[PDB]
Nucleic acid binder design. Structure first.
Ligand SMILES: [Mn+2]
Ligand SMILES: [Mn+2]
Ligand SMILES: [Mn+2]
Ligand SMILES: [Mn+2]
Ligand SMILES: [Mn+2]
Ligand SMILES: [Mn+2]
Ligand SMILES: [Mn+2]
Ligand SMILES: [Mn+2]
Ligand SMILES: [Mn+2]
Ligand SMILES: [Mn+2]
Ligand SMILES: [Mn+2]
Lengths: 244, 244
RNA sequence: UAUGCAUGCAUU
RNA sequence: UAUGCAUGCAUU
């Protein structure tokens, strides 16, 4: 665990950058009934080596929409600087994702994604500023947080009531809202596919509304994990595997 | 692949040893409705290090009917011959025989009354698969259990075969594998109610096919019978506990 | 045999 | 995040 000085610096940085988050739609395709104008959807992920605390592999992919085919992949081995601490995920993974976005601008600027799906929460976060917000503010790209487990903050809990609501999700696209003790809607549970029971937890990262974020996440789901995140996960793990 | 002159020598050896296979019951517990008298069921497997020489050969003995492991011998070995379909014994069997001999020296009262082998017996290009080969070299009763169909003597995994598999509806259901010669070479077996891919069971030595199938079914907590499953799990764990 | 993917359970 | 197991499909 990092020293308190590091964690203090981290909390202060999250509070500083949180003032820049935009939690409403700012792109014309977002207000379109079929997302007309949306052509490129990004996904990011970092995979790790079981033996090694230093080496990781970061991946950025860009997919065509609505076809969901990979038109760009950049995967690179990186040197880890921070350990994993819940609530501070960005300080472990986000510096490498920002660099991949910058490399894309240098290499294939016409494939810059119009929105990025991030493997982690956005505003559903201990301090309202998860990795998806953090990437969005540092890149100014619209970003969606997609998490596979419920971050138990603001009274949210994976209890019997929560599991009851999960059973009530019956088809792909069904949802229920994640309400905090303050009464605010932090995100949505989403049944991403007809043949999956475990929901995704979707929240706003940056420059998108929750309703649009949920609907786009659903439209990217060939399987349970949305295809951009899924392809970034698959390809970064393949890189680690082929270099053992 | 070994040269054809080598494979021809191996075929000749398989033909000579086949004269020693006994494909009927020779143990009093075998004809018993509940296998009363059966206390010890063996299982063998060889796992490999993803390096072509090093492997881990495992012998387990399980109590019956509780299916609890009362003996495990997992041994790193230097494997020499490559896998050639129809010649599996020339890769794995010398090391399995050595494990049985080690058991006799170490815990002779735990010698198994029957061994389940991860591979075919008489269901085989020349009617003499690895399970027959282990049985004849140890004189132990042996059952061959394969996880996919060896396509010999007109047997094929075609649509007709797949339709018969769909007719297997409950755990214990079987259908016979009839060769073009008119012989019943083995049985397809549905291991349990929640599995659809069958096991392919055949006589190794000193057991009838009907008894071999019924005992295989009694060892199935999951799709793979518990003696083979434990040998597979524990030999893989042994490899990880060193190299993995 | 080893690996990949899908779906779920557990551990972390 | 990584690992184990379960069930299926695929490559070999
Ligand atoms: Mn379009
Ligand atoms: Mn991730
Ligand atoms: Mn991942
Ligand atoms: Mn690759
Ligand atoms: Mn008994
Ligand atoms: Mn095997
Ligand atoms: Mn095995
Ligand atoms: Mn295996
Ligand atoms: Mn999984
Ligand atoms: Mn993972
Ligand atoms: Mn499997």
């Amino acid at each position: 665990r990092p020293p308190e000085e590091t964690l203090s610096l981290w909390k202060g940085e999250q509070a500083r950058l949180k003032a820049r988050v935009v939690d409403r739609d700012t792109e014309a395709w977002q207000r379109d009934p079929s997302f007309s104008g949306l052509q490129k959807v990004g996904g990011v992920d970092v995979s790790f080596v079981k033996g090694d605390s230093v080496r990781a592999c970061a991946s950025l992919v860009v997919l065509s929409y609505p076809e969901l085919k990979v038109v760009y992949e950049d995967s690179r081995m990186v040197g880890l600087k921070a350990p994993y601490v819940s609530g501070f995920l960005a300080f472990r993974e986000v510096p490498f994702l920002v660099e991949l976005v910058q490399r894309l601008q240098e290499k294939e600027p016409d494939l810059m994604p119009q929105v990025v799906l991030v493997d982690g929460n956005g505003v559903l976060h201990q301090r309202g500023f998860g990795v998806a917000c953090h990437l969005g503010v540092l890149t100014e790209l619209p970003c969606i947080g997609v998490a596979k487990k419920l971050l138990q903050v603001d009274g949210l809990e994976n209890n019997a009531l929560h599991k009851e609501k999960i059973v009530l999700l019956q088809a792909g696209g069904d949802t229920f809202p994640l309400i905090g003790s303050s009464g605010t809607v932090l995100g949505m549970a989403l049944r991403s596919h007809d043949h999956s029971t475990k929901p995704l937890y979707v929240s706003v990262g940056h420059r998108i509304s929750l309703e649009v974020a949920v609907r786009l996440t659903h439209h990217c789901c060939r399987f349970r994990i949305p295809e951009p995140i899924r392809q970034a996960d698959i390809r970064s793990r393949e890189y680690i595997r082929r270099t053992l």
